[PDB]
């Protein structure tokens, strides 16, 4: 039937940054959670709240698909209730989450021998992010007591740093494309079901 659009959300030309992750509603379609295992020999499929073989038996109404690129040593931070410089200022999952965080190495897709300011991450922020919140704002972070007046100087930093992605790095510094498949079920006719 109408296969869910899991082809352009996973196999895309360029993915998102950690501070500007993209949501995508996936609905009015029949999801097939089996074509994902063509993507990468190195393919983690950590799920929460749902068994990896139970998605093909339940019906949901709106399955959301986030996307961002994080370094290796930072996947673990995409988990319910876990701290870190990425899971506090860029993307935080709720403590009671129902989904499947998916990650895979992408050192061949997007890693050029130069460093490109293509993937950014938020290093400084006022407070921690609420669950499912995106802050694309780029105001000058006041790190001291004097006002910044919109100029990045002393005690006033730019709140976005750029990752360095080179193929010569170790497994703990190569880019990892991550997609968080959320599943919500409201009082509405469920459209996203399994292949029957």
């Amino acid at each position: 039937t109408n296969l869910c659009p899991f082809d352009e959300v996973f196999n895309a030309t360029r993915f998102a940054s950690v501070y500007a992750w993209n949501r995508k509603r996936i609905s009015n379609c029949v999801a097939d959670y089996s074509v994902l295992y063509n993507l990468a020999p190195f393919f983690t499929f950590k799920c929460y709240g749902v068994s990896p073989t139970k998605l093909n038996d339940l019906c949901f109404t709106n399955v959301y698909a986030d996307s961002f690129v994080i370094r290796g040593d930072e996947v673990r931070q995409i988990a319910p209730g876990q701290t870190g410089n990425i899971a506090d200022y860029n993307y935080k999952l709720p403590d009671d989450f129902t989904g499947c965080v998916i990650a895979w190495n992408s050192n061949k897709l997007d890693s050029k021998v130069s460093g490109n300011y293509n993937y950014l991450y938020r290093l400084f922020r006022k407070s921690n992010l609420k669950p499912f919140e995106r802050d694309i704002s780029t105001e000058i972070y006041q790190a001291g007591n004097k006002p910044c007046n919109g100029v990045a100087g002393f005690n006033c930093y730019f709140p976005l740093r750029s990752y360095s992605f080179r193929p010569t790095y170790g497994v703990g510094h190569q880019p990892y494309r991550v997609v968080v498949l959320s599943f919500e079920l409201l009082h509405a006719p469920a459209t996203v079901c399994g292949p029957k």
Partner: antibody, heavy 126, light 108 residues
Framework: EVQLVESGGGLVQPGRSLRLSCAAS????????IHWVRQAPGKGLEWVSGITWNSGTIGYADSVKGRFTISRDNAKNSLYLQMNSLRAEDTALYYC???????????????????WGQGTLVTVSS | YELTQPPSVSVAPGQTARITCGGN??????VHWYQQKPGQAPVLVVYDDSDRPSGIPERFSGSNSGNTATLTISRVEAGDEADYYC???????????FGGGTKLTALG
């Protein structure tokens, strides 16, 4: 039909920052990559940056790396471009150009603009 | 990449004009052209060297071969005086390379 209205622009001192916006209206702001392209007064065109349908940069120029940052908001139908550390050679009419194709998954990267706007004169002087 | 165009190409409104854009090995990557009247926004003309958008007359045509892309405008008129730019992708540096456009001026 397509109305790529661009807001944000004016006189700013060398070394300060401003934020540009581009409110789209007419098409679906979830399947078309939208770029930013400048044009100095009577001095040709120049490409700044761009973002695909998923919010991801398609690259920067050879003179705006590290100083410019582009962001996309698919819910409000608006593309944003942050300009930090402006200099005297950044005075131009910044356009907001779209992409003709629908950005299918498996293809070859080739961006050609089909709908343009009017631009905002971002003058940088003392 | 780096595209180079003739700074000015003039032709009487009886014949065709020859606008070229040459680089290093621009024979395979797609070459798109743009037209910009003085004051207005750049409009689209024949792209991919083989097809034009909806509305552009059949007079506009293109051809790319090896190291030269030719935007041959047929039956040039007075209302076609504009600044024509050529575009390329250059997947090597993740950019969008334009070029110093040509000022087509109907002489006479």
């Amino acid at each position: 039909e397509v109305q790529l209205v661009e807001s944000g622009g004016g006189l700013v001192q060398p070394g300060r920052s401003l934020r540009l916006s581009c409110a789209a209206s007419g098409f679906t702001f979830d399947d078309y990559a939208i770029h930013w392209v400048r044009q100095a007064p009577g001095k040709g065109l120049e490409w700044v940056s761009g973002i695909t349908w998923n919010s991801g940069t398609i690259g920067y120029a050879d003179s705006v790396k590290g100083r410019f940052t582009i962001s996309r908001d698919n819910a409000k139908n608006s593309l944003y471009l942050q300009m930090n550390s402006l200099r005297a050679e950044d005075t131009a009419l910044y356009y907001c150009a779209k992409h003709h194709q629908i950005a299918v998954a498996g293809d070859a990267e080739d961006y050609y603009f089909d709908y343009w706007g009017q631009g905002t004169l971002v003058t940088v002087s003392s | 990449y780096e595209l180079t165009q003739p700074p000015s190409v003039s032709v009487a409104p009886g014949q065709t004009a020859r606008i070229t854009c040459g680089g290093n090995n621009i024979g395979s990557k797609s070459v798109h052209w743009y037209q910009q009247k003085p004051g207005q926004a750049p409009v689209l003309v024949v792209y991919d060297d083989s097809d034009r958008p909806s509305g552009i007359p059949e007079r506009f045509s293109g051809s790319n071969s090896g190291n030269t892309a030719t935007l041959t405008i047929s039956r040039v008129e007075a209302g076609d005086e504009a600044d024509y730019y050529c575009q390329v992708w250059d997947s090597r540096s993740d950019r969008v390379v334009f070029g110093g456009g040509t000022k087509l001026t109907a002489l006479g």
